Structure 1
Amino acid sequence: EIRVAEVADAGVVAKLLRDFNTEFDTPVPEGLEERFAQIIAHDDAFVLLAGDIGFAYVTLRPSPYYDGPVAMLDELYVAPAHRNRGVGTALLQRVFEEIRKHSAGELQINVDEVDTDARRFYERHGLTNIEQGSRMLLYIREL
């Protein structure tokens, strides 16, 4: 079932994020668990857990366009053996439900162009890459 993570669940969330990065051959910094414990307790952010096999990490930030925040689904992951059985759909549905309790004006998600399965999933569940007739790109600088 989906539930909202408590501070004491930080270790499970961190493990799943580590698994996600390992799946993508990306090294992870130390301290994921300690940071997730802090974020879950104190910040305008939440984590949803599907048992111990999937999670969603959402941040809520201010926007002049809305009375409520703009939400970002910063991380969404289901463990590979549990995919294609509706877990990601359930997590994303619960994301929409939870951000609606905050009157969020919009949900954003960053995705690599090459991740066509994720893109297909998001496009089939109501998200779009198009604004004013153009694709939207994410630019970053790591610091």
Structure 2
Amino acid sequence: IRVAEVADAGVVAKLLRDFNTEFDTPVPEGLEERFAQIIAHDDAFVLLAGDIGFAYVTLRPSPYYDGPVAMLDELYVAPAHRNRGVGTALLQRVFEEIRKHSAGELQINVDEVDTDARRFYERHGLTNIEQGSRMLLYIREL
């Protein structure tokens, strides 16, 4: 696993394209050019497991912590390479990398029906319960 460089924007864009296609979710135009800009800056990073898996992490400020709040905005391993520990290794490296940023928390948006992903996340120390209540994510696309 490596932190992506700007030179990796093309492979990151390919993997997100494959991800969204697999899940019948639209593929934005211009992914490679945006990833090249995003990777060049310090409020986000991408981890690559060779060319077959990736984690996209954003950082944003919080008044609760000197460091940022981290969000795992995308986690994906190519279908032929799943169930071999790649995703586990990616997530562990997420924690290691955000720790270098003194991140106070990791947050992940997860669809409720994705029970296999939820089992993976809960196995690795993420929780959806806060004081007996589930935490919900509400959005408005603009």
For normalisation by structure 2, the TM-score amounts to 0.99
Q: What is the Cα deviation at residue 58 of structure 1?
A: 0.2
In terms of mean alpha carbon deviation, does 21-30 or 6-15 score higher? 21-30
Partner Cα separation in structure 2 for residue 114 and residue 96 of structure 1? 25
Q: Deviations over 1:22-72 (max 9, x none)?
A: 001112121000000000002400000000000000000000110000000
Structure 2 SS opposite 1:46? strand
Structure 2 SS opposite 1:42? coil
Partner Cα separation in structure 2 for residue 102 and residue 131 of structure 1? 25
Partner Cα separation in structure 1 for residue 33 and residue 88 of structure 2? 28
Structure 1 SS opposite 2:109? strand
Q: Please list every run of 5 or more consecutive structure 1 residues that lacks an aligned counterpart in the other structure.
A: none
Count of aligned pairs between the two proteins = 142
Structure 2 SS opposite 1:59? strand
Partner Cα separation in structure 2 for residue 12 and residue 82 of structure 1? 16
Q: Please list every run of 5 or more consecutive structure 2 residues that lacks an aligned counterpart in the other structure.
A: none
Runs of 4 or more, structure 1, over 6 Å off, are none
Structure 2 SS opposite 1:94? helix
**Aligned-residue identity in percent:** 100
Q: Deviations over 1:101-120 (max 9, x none)?
A: 00000000000000000000
